[PDB]
Amino acid sequence: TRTKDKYRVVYTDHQRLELEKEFHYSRYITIRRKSELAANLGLTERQVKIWFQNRRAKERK
DNA sequence: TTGTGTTTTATGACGTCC
DNA sequence: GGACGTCATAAAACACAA
């Protein structure tokens, strides 16, 4: 769906920062918010979703 | 350097929506 | 039969004592 002949892609610093800020604001992301964020950062909704899931896991750990 | 231990993307499997 | 949540796990990329 995302993966191809780039197994995984390194997110820019800026992107990462934005995501972190969003996470801090709230740990779950609304569909609308997700859509906005993907639009404004050059990532797919799906990518954003994945990231949030990862981040929650990380927090738990 | 460069091993090697850890972190970041990403997936399928399985679970719960109030 | 979707959407999103967990999780164990693979592989690329990084962090950094040695």
Curated annotation (Swiss-Prot):
Residues 4-61 bind DNA. It is found in: Nucleus. The gene is CDX1. Residues 46-57 are annotated as: Interaction with 5-mCpG DNA. Residues 7-28 are annotated as: Interaction with DNA. This is Homeobox protein CDX-1. Belongs to the Caudal homeobox family. Intestinal epithelium. Plays a role in transcriptional regulation. Involved in activated KRAS-mediated transcriptional activation of PRKD1 in colorectal cancer (CRC) cells. Binds to the PRKD1 promoter in colorectal cancer (CRC) cells. Could play a role in the terminal differentiation of the intestine. Binds preferentially to methylated DNA. It comes from Homo sapiens (Human).
